[PDB]
Amino acid sequence: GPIRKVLLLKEDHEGLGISITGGKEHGVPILISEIHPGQPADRCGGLHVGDAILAVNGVNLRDTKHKEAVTILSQQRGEIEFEVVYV
């Protein structure tokens, strides 16, 4: 599908509300495997199971290992821009 830019708003007491799988060491993108109901990704409306996370706040995640992506993603605060694509 088309590459999309999606905005997520979260407070500091919350996580993103997504489960991710995949990563470069497995030869696949960082993939959303769950959107947790009522948490920030669900509330933002534009992120879905099966989306590959290509970048967050301008940081490329296309070639990131799983744990690298966890560190980068969990560092982001407040108004967070995602670049995603569903395949």
């Binding site: 996580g15 993103l16 997504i18 489960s19 991710i20 799988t21 995949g22 990563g23 497995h26 696949v28 495997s33 769950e34 947790h36 799983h66 744990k67 966890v70 993603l73 969990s74």
Partner: peptide, 6 residues
């Protein structure tokens, strides 16, 4: 593959 909740 591993899965992480974040």
């Amino acid at each position: 593959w591993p899965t992480s909740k974040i």
